[PDB]
Amino acid sequence: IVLDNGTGFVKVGYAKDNFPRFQFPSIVGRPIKDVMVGDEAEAVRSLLQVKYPMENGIIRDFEEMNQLWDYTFFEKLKIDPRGRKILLTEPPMNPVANREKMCETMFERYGFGGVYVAIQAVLSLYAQGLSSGVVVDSGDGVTHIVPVYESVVLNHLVGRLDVAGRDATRYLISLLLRKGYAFNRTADFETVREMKEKLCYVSYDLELDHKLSEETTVLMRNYTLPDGRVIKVGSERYECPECLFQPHLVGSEQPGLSEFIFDTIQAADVDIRKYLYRAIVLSGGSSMYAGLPSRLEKEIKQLWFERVLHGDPARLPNFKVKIEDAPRRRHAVFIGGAVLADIMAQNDHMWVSKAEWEEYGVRALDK
Amino acid sequence: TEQDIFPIRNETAEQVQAAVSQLIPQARSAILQGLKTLLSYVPYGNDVQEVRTQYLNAFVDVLSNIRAADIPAFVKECSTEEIDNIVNFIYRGLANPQAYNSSVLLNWHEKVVEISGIGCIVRVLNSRPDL
Amino acid sequence: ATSQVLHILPKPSYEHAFNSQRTEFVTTTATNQVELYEQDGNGWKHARTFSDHDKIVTCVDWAPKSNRIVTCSQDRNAYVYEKRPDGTWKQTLVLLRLNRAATFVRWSPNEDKFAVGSGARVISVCYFEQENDWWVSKHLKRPLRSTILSLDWHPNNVLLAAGCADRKAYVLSAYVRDVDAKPEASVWGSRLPFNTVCAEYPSGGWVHAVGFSPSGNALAYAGHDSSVTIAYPSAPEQPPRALITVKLSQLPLRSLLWANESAIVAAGYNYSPILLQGNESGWAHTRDLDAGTSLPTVHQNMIATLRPYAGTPGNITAFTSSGTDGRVVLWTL
Amino acid sequence: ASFNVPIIMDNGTGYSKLGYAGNDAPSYVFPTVIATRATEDLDFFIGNDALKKASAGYSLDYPIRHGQIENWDHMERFWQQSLFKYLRCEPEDHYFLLTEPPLNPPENRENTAEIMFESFNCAGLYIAVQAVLALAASWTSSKVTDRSLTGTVVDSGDGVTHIIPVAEGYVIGSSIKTMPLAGRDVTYFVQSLLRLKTAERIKEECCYVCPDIVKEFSRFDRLKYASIDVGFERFLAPEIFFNPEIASSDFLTPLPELVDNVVQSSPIDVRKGLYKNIVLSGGSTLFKNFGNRLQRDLKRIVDERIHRSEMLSGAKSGGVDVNVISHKRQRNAVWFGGSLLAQTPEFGSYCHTKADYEEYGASIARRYQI
Amino acid sequence: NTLRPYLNAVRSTLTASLALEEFSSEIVERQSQPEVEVGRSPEILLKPLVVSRNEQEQCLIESSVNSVRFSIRIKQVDEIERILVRKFMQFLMGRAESFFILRRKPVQGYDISFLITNYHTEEMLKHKLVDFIIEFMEEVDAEISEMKLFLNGRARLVAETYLSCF
Amino acid sequence: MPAYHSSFLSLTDVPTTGNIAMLPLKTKFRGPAYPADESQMDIIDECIGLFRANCFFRNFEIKGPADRTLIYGTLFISECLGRVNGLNYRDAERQLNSLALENFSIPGSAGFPLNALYAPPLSPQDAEIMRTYLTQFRQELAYRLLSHVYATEKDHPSKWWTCFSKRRFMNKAL
Amino acid sequence: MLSLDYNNIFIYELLTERFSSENPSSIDQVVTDFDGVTFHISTPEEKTKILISCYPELVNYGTLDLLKQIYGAYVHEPEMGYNFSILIDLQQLPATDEEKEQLAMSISMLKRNVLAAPFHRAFTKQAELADLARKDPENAPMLDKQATSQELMAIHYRDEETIVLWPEHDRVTVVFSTKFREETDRIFGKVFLQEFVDARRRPAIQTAPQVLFSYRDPPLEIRDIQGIQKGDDFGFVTFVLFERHFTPQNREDCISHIQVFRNTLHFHIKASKAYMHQRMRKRVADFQKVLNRAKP
Ligand SMILES: Nc1ncnc2c1ncn2[C@@H]1O[C@H](COP(=O)(O)OP(=O)(O)OP(=O)(O)O)[C@@H](O)[C@H]1O
Ligand SMILES: Nc1ncnc2c1ncn2[C@@H]1O[C@H](COP(=O)(O)OP(=O)(O)OP(=O)(O)O)[C@@H](O)[C@H]1O
Ligand SMILES: [Mg+2]
């Protein structure tokens, strides 16, 4: 039905589905077909040069993306490329050239009669039943954020944080190395990732973290490597996600995940902040860590009652920083788009079907 | 204080500070007779600390200066409240082994635990927050 | 005298969760996975397992009349499993917004709703919403002020009990407008409103569960201080007519109930089931079910929650218990 | 006193090496074994003493197994005895150095540090990997003649062999292929082609190395009596390792193929450097005309990888830079390079003194530097 | 003999206070933390019971729902036993991963402090550990006594073998 | 590898029969092949060296006749060395003759493995040709071995030539 | 081992191996012994001429006489470094029955031989004093008190260590010094030095010399020494040498036995510490076994 073109990974499933159906990463191999694609590029990546066309919201391998979409429409969907419709959404703050190229392709390559290219943040925010609010879209390589109001996102408040999963994994492996072990940066990039999301949990308690790590053993765990060697991890389990809150540790001068969000919130007028405060949510890397909602809520409260004008906690309950924690935050935008595409299907007011396929004039702005 | 603590403010009798002294005087004059008076009234948990410490010291001294020939008699002849109170008193007195010897206290604790039941210690463990 | 040994179950049981016919019991394993067994010649056998959970599952339940199964965990949400006609068990999620993790869950008598032991300062209840597929959420902030540990459902759609962490024993009520169940008046409260409270009975310490006579009255509850208390309320504004607190000499217990109209049985940390009578103007301990009090006793570990037997709503004269090392037993009397 | 000559001790299976820096030959050599036996429970021989007193040594068991320390109670005794009765060294006079097989676990390394630090009350600990210690010994050759920690360490032992590449000093043990074939295979081959002490004496006295047996036989028809005759056995001995099928068909993977797989498993970016220079550890695979044989085998096996890949892919890759360098005396070269590495003035800038331990415990005992 | 009464008392109080149950931290979500180290937890912690038979030895028996602690002060009168028990506890707490129960930094003013959680109580029996605690204490006492008695032999042997050479 | 390659067979043209090809060489007895252009290096001489080198080998990639002929020559040389390992010169020559110029028919006899001997059997249209070729080749190889291995002694061959016959091609020695 | 060897094992083995060998190769080893010393075994130019390599304090006192008298004409250039070189050749030996072993033992004990020169003057002075106060026992105390504080010499074989000696009448006493950098080592040394003085009470060993102890109260006669004064992390032990032990008939073994007094104590202390560690490891293994068995 529809899909969500992501930088690192990509999903696809039927419209109004209970859960996703297919999941493939944007890592093409190079040797078994001519060029590895998805499973053929991941499971057989040992003897194939992997490649990630989508990166930083841009693309460089046009033929690679073409083959990816062809294989998708052939097997993942099992539907005719022209006898069906789709609705994709690129990352926020993307260029217009990419959207124009995608439209030209969907119009003159597969024969799609009706398509739609919206903003992923808008769909992720609408999936939760809200027309005005904010979203923390911590992408795989860049954490983009932009508010929403009146069914339109404010371009002035659009931004992107340098922190991402790559820097997190890099700091994790660096800490595992400096802790006593001797690992390589590219020796095993999958075991470290599997162990991070399995044993690491973000916690905004630095005074208690090291105390419990150096005064107790319950924090210690026993992890098994792929070969069989028993590896141990101690205080390096909670320090890994701390790079998001301290960009200066990863070698990038940035306020922080919460400090920057605040600076952007109070940057606009007070008429919108009243509703933006009760819509603090995240969809992506900033909504999958354990203990992240409480941490960001505490940070927001602190920077609220100790930043602008506050001397005593006599009005702490006036401002309510609503931070929703959606369990399906990874597929939030996917479900939003899947549920929205059904309302615009029967509607004949969409100026895309029968117009953005072959009837191209001299104006292609309404897209 | 606010929660998990029944007594909150008992200044009506705490400010007096006379019942404890009267009870300690009769016990001292008498010194299977101590527990009758020394256990008739427990130190009321309040802002008074010197009187409570004095009463605890007096009770410990009375327990030490007691006939240890056949403790089982008094151990079995006592109500649940009395055994619980004496167990709590022994537990609170065994905290400072410098002033007291604590040998008689430990012996009485072991005897009341092995003669009455194996639940008195658990019951006395969950005492008041500041009493 | 009477005993029975089933699958050793080398995992923390903490539950029994029998089925409708009491033939397909479910139990946790300190992991997202779940273990299900089927009847076999003089014992059970592995039948199927469940998945899709993130953190260890804590409590589950199954209403015998409907043959449904509901589960919860410390994952901010709870799941429910339905019986599939093909020969398997379906899985479905319920939309409920909470602030902390859940600890306990209990089904409803008439099979119309359920309660969850949210670890936060609020309790939630869900049900089947008309003209929809998901279950609406719920929360209460006025009556409760701290976390809850145990839960119990009176034989009705009102007066939902709740075991608070503090020494007080709170009690709530859930009367939804869409639910046509009329809130009949009783001794607890006549024409009680949606949100209300009956009385905060100060216990002798902690609270592990609340008892309920087969008739409905004579509320009771136990605690960690090795003591059990009863109550005979006469009005929502009057005090109890008889508040007797009996303190057993053995180790404390948990998850009590009302075996007979007068007799009460329960177990817990102590390695022996207790047996005592009950009266409105008297109380005394008779003896224990064990007849041998590495170890001489049968159960050489901590006893887990205790569930009743089918029997009859008026009297059962039987029950089942287990421990942290499995070895479920089906006592009698 | 922070300036005296350090000490290097590379203790391992079989023979254990120990001596001082700024030298070329070992000061003591003997097998790692002790002749363990009311009171006076400390009388047990060590080394050659135990080898001779085996008559009453009462089951002289080995204290080391598979390189990893398994019996610390006996390892500490062996260490202190070899240090006091066979070295006559003062621990509170200079720095120390311990040995650790490749991928030594933090638990064992910290245990060794704590048992060698608090027991003798020394001042200064240092542990490294055998790969770097062996690679530092090849600096004497005219090929590198400088500090360049880039290559591979192929440790060929008497019982078994292994390989552990290093990426700019950091040994990456993510992809390694060990060769169980060792001197025992050639010993059994020689013993079978003549149908312990005599076998070793015959194997350590005459061993030729030929390009191919087809030419060795042709050159033989166109020889020595010691100890009792010789022949094509000297030519067939070395090939037992080159072509495992000759000695043992179990591990058909030959040495060139294993090296190619190990160097191609890692990313090509670092493999281009790893495949430049390689050094062999120990002195087991050191036979007359051996190094050049392996070099020729590798440069012949790389044909189908370079020449064919150039036409298949269509890109001139002038990567003809491989040059293997063999050690002159590697029988005890594990510490030869360690001596040169420790003789640098900056050797003490990456150690831990008593002040860095008395107030830190056994926590900082794993992270080191060059 | 004031040793057996104290041993019986500590055994009984430990068996009575050993009650571990699963509890979720009402402060942070989806992280099971202790109740004696993080935050305050006023309405969960019990009264810290202590038992003592002398002035130089004691044990603080603290209790909680999932953070029960326990510590003992080994008897020490001379510098020999002092440094002996110091080094022993140091080496024992250094490799805390072996037992998975001992701590790394005992509480201030004590020698060694243990730590038990719900998992540790379910992976092993109750009376077994209760008896093992007393057995380990008695064995440590006997080993310290032996070490004190084992040095005299070596000392006299060295003296006799160094003075008899002449 | 250390095996003995054929270096004579190809995939262009050859007088093959069943599973092997023809290899013209110089011989005194009757042969099916014709005289070669030059006697600089015959196949019977290279086969002896190939067998002496592969006696201690595992196997060889059978590629048409190139490997079949080499395996046959190695087996014949091993049999000759085992029959005349340490026997008298007269008896050794008698056995060599009785094994080379015997009534041995086309391959495919019982007892011995038919797969290792000759997989594709083609008796018709080449029976006599194959028989005479095998006879001539066996006689030539036996005579060459008896002339080469024989040292300056009174018909005493090299000791190693007879003592290094423990194994065989594909472990076909015991 | 209960008695430390006085001869270097390395040299004692190398010399006896090269004397019987027939292919002497080059040697470039640098061995070091106790008391902060360094040796250099190497040949300058040839392959057979073995050139084997705190000192000013003994040079200004005079010690080369005995070394030369014992070594013959094998001395060589100072050879800046250890400051005492020796030239040995494996081709001009006088015999091989026992002279080889004698020369090996001498080259191994060179350390003690150099550290034994200050004792000859003490022996001579003690003999002279005994001969002076032989026929007249009286008047000995004042003469002895006047014949000290001027001839006593101090040895500096370490940045902090220091040993002194002075003669007496009918006997001679010495004193040592030690610096402990730990409390456990201090206690071990204390108990060892106490057992040393306590062991003489036995009648079977009553003939042994008398040994005293002094931790913070050093002798007032030696306090005048310019060396280190009384200190907290210091321990001095005094010994006595009687005529029966100081007799020339048995004057070669006692010197070597006393020259290794500072190392034997530390060696025994470290052995005891290793035994303590072994017992602790055994107890830990037992506790681990019990814990693993406690499981169901
Ligand atoms: N279990 C986990 N918990 C938390 N983070 C995880 C987990 N597994 C993977 N990640 C991280 O999630 C990130 C990828 O998230 P996701 O796939 O949602 O990104 P995306 O939406 O494709 O990104 P973008 O919008 O930038 O294209 C990576 O940093 C990855 O390491
Ligand atoms: N020049 C040589 N040629 C062939 N073999 C040799 C040569 N020199 C030594 N060997 C043999 O090599 C084998 C290994 O010797 P090496 O000193 O390398 O062993 P090692 O690495 O200490 O052994 P282990 O790993 O078992 O402790 C021994 O059998 C030895 O005799
Ligand atoms: Mg080696």
- SS3 for chain E is CCHHHHHHHHHHHHHHHCCCCCCCCCCCCCCCCCCCCCCCCCCCCCCCEEECCCCCCEEEEECCCCCCEEEEECCCCCHHHHHHHHHHHHHHHHCCCCCCCCCCCCCCCCCEEEECCHHHHHHCCHHHHHHHHHHHHHHHHHHHHHHHHHHHHHHHHHHHHHHCCC
Q: Which one of 6.10.20.160, 3.40.190.290, 3.40.50.300, 2.30.140.10 gives the CATH number of domain F44-172?
A: 6.10.20.160
Kindly list the distances between the CA atom of residue G126 and the CA atoms of G123, G171, G221, in Å, as whole numbers in the listed order: 5, 8, 18
Gap between the Cα atoms of A299 and C270, Å rounded = 46
Q: Given D106, D170, D175, which is nearest A180 (Cβ)? A: D106
Three-state DSSP at F93 gives: helix
Distance in Å, CA D343 to ligand 2 centroid: 27
Look-up of token digits 């008559």: D55
CATH 1.25.40.10 fits A165-244, yes or no: no
Structure tokens at A182: 């001797």
CB contact (8 A) between residue E26 and residue C147: yes
Query: What's the half-sphere exposure (Cβ side, CA atoms, 13 Å) at C326?
Result: 17
CATH number for the domain whose boundaries are D181-252 = 3.90.640.10
Q: Give how many domains chain E has, as a whole number.
A: 1
Helices G261-293, D72-84: axis angle to 10 degrees equals: 170
**Greatest Cα pair distance in chain E:** 77
C129 vs D350: CA distance, rounded Å = 69
Backbone angles phi, psi at F50, to 5 degrees: -60, -45
Handedness of CA C115, C116, C122, C124 (dihedral sign): negative
Q: How far apart are CA D89 and CA D99, in angstroms?
A: 18
Other Cβ atoms closer than 10 A to E139: 15
Taking 3-state DSSP, the helix, strand and coil percentages for chain G, each rounded to the nearest 5, stand at 45, 10, 45
Structure determination method: cryo-EM
**φ and ψ at B75, to 5 degrees?**
-65, -40
Which residues are within 8 A (CB) of D51 and not within 5 positions of it... i.e. 6 or more apart? D30, D31, D33
Q: What angle, rounded to 10 degrees, do the helices at G64-71 and G99-114 form?
A: 180
Q: Tokens for C168?
A: 């007080």
Count how many pairs of residues, chain C against chain E, have C-beta atoms within 8 Å. Answer: 46
Rounded distance, CA C17 to CA C27, Å? 7
F127-149 and F89-100 are packed helices; what angle lies between their axes, rounded to 10 degrees?
Answer: 160
Are E71 and E112 a contacting pair, CB within 8 Å? Answer: yes
Question: In the block, which residue shows the tokens 């009174």?
Answer: F154
Neighbors of chain E by Cβ distance (3+ pairs < 8 Å): A, B, C, D, G
Does D30 lie at the interface with G, CB-CB under 8 angstroms? no
Radius of gyration of chain C (CA): 20
Give A285 Cα–ligand 1 centroid separation in angstroms.
Answer: 5
d(CA A287, CA A328): 9
Q: What is the CATH number of the domain that holds G264?
A: 3.30.1460.20
3 state SS of C122? coil
Residues 6+ apart with CB under 8 A from D104: D68, D127, D129
CATH number at residue E42: 3.30.1460.20
Q: Are the beta carbons of G261 and G3 closer than 8 angstroms?
A: no
Cβ–Cβ under 8 Å, residues C223 and C213: no
How far apart CA C215 and CA C280 sit, in angstroms, is: 15
Cα–Cα distance measured from residue D27 to residue D19, given in angstroms and rounded to the nearest whole number: 5
Resolution for the entry shown, Å: 4.2
Out of E2, E17, E50, closest to residue B94 by CB: E50
Same fold, D131-180+253-333 and D181-252: no
Distances in Å between the Cα of C281 and the Cα atoms of C65, C203, C232, C262, C278 are 37, 20, 11, 12, 9
Residue A272 backbone zone (phi > 0: left; psi -120 to 50: alpha; other: beta): alpha
Indicate the number of domains in chain G.
2
G49 in the same domain as G187: no
DSSP3 helix / strand / coil % (chain D, rounded to 5): 40, 10, 50
Residue A198: closest C-alpha in chain C: C54
Question: CATH class for domain D2-130+334-368?
Answer: alpha beta
Interchain contact B114–E (C-beta under 8 A): yes
Q: How far apart are CA G292 and CA G296, in angstroms?
A: 9
> C181 near C155, Cβ under 8 Å?
no
Alpha-helix runs per DSSP H in chain D: 48-53, 72-84, 106-117, 130-135, 183-192, 197-203, 213-220, 233-242, 244-247, 255-265, 268-274, 291-301, 303-309, 336-342, 355-358
Half-sphere exposure of G235 (CA within 13 A, CB side): 21
Say whether both G102 and G219 belong to one domain. Answer: no
Rounded to a whole number, what is the largest CA-CA distance in chain F?
Answer: 47
Listed in sequence order, the DSSP H helices in chain F are 43-54, 65-83, 89-100, 114-117, 127-149, 159-163
Q: Is A288 exposed, middle or buried (0-12, 13-18, 19+ CB in 10 A)?
A: middle
User: If DSSP states are collapsed to H, E and C, what string results for A254-275?
Assistant: CCCHHHHHHHHHCCCCHHHHHH
Q: Are residues G244 and G257 in the same domain?
A: yes
Q: What is the CATH number of domain D131-180+253-333?
A: 3.30.420.40
> Cα separation of F125 and A92, whole Å?
82
Q: Which of E125, E140, E162 sits opposite G296 (nearest CB)?
A: E125
Is there a single domain that holds both residue G160 and residue G286? yes
For residue C332, the cross-strand partners are: C318
Final residue of a structural domain among G86, G110, G125: G125
Q: How far is it, in rounded angstroms, from Cα C210 to Cα E78? A: 56
Of residues A107, A82, A91, the one with CA closest to residue A10: A91
Cα(G84)–Cα(G30) distance, integer angstroms: 15
Cβ neighbour number for residue A269 with a 10 Å cutoff: 8
**Distance, CA of F67 to CA of A172 (rounded, Å):** 58
By CB atoms closer than 10 A (0-12, 13-18, 19+), residue G272 is buried
Pick out the residues of the known binding site of A for ATP: 139-141, 193-197, 284-289
User: How many Å lie between the centroid of ligand 3 and the Cα of residue E144?
Assistant: 42
Tokens of A139: 């992408």
CATH superfamily, domain at C1-333: YVTN repeat-like/Quinoprotein amine dehydrogenase (2.130.10.10)
- The alpha carbon of A116 is separated from its chain's Cα centroid by a whole number of angstroms, namely 20
* Closest CA relative to residue D54, chosen from D31, D78, D87, D86: D31
Chain D residues in contact with A192 (beta carbon < 8 A): none
Span from the CA of D327 to the centroid of ligand 2 (angstroms): 14
Provide the token pair at D224: 């020595």
Residue nearest to atom 6 of ligand 1 (CA): A197
Go through the domains of chain B in sequence order and give each one's CATH number.
Answer: 16-128 (1.25.40.190)
What is the C-alpha to C-alpha distance for residues D186 and D23, in angstroms, rounded to an integer?
33
Which residues from A are below 8 Å from E101, CB to CB? Answer: 217
If you ran DSSP here, which 8-state letter would residue C64 be given? T
Angle at the Cα of G36 from the Cα atoms of G35 and G37, rounded to 5 degrees: 100
Asked if D205 and D226 touch (Cβ cutoff 8 Å), the reply is: yes
Would you give the distance in Å from CA B19 to the centre of its chain? 15
Rounded-to-integer distance, Cα D256 and Cα F169, Å: 25
List the one residue out of D197, A67, B94, C230 whose CA is nearest residue E9: B94
Residue nearest to atom 3 of ligand 1 (CA): A197
Coil, strand, or helix at residue F133?
A: helix
Two tokens, residue C329? 């037993």
